[PDB]
Design a protein around this ligand. Structure first.
Ligand SMILES: [Ca+2]
Ligand SMILES: [Ca+2]
Ligand SMILES: [Ca+2]
Ligand SMILES: [Cl-]
Length: 98
DNA sequence: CGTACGTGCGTTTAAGCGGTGCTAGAGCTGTCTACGACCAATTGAGCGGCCTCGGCACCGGGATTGTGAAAAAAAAAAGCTGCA
């Protein structure tokens, strides 16, 4: 024993995004806990529906297109437009880096 | 207390029905290869742990903000009649 086991989180990232969006504001541990719950919630919803989609169409593979269709299903209007936008942009940029 | 909405009637409308003809496209098969799993070697990003100091929570004691009472006033209204 002697050292507690490692429990992953999105904290470093939530913080990274925080400095982008507001360089001089911090975040309490409870607030960070809510953010981590948030990310995990949504991960699970999007992956979940992506999972159904693939299975509903007899595909073994969850691709970027299943994420997109799921994102359209789970987010409301404006949020989904921008979400699909950022998702599209990111995959683009990522294939350019090769 | 006033009328909206239920009831019942005569007239009008088009749903449903049974059928026929045409064709998009659902869904299957066979081929072929790009891509994702799986691997072993490599290494850097993120883990837990720990220290510092700055943000925020307290606290007190001063200023603004609404509420309720009481009063004035206004203003109505109520009770009652003159006079035409
Ligand atoms: Ca086809
Ligand atoms: Ca392919
Ligand atoms: Ca830490
Ligand atoms: Cl993909």
């Amino acid at each position: 024993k002697r050292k507690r086991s490692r429990k992953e989180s999105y904290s470093i990232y939530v913080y990274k995004v925080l400095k982008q969006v507001h360089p001089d504001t911090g975040i309490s541990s409870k607030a960070m806990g809510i953010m981590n719950s948030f990310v995990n919630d949504i991960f699970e919803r999007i992956a979940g529906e992506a999972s159904r989609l693939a299975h509903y169409n007899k595909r073994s593979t969850i691709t970027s297109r299943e994420i997109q269709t799921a994102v359209r299903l789970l987010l409301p209007g404006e949020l989904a437009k921008h979400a699909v936008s950022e998702g599209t942009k990111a995959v683009t940029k990522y294939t350019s880096a090769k």
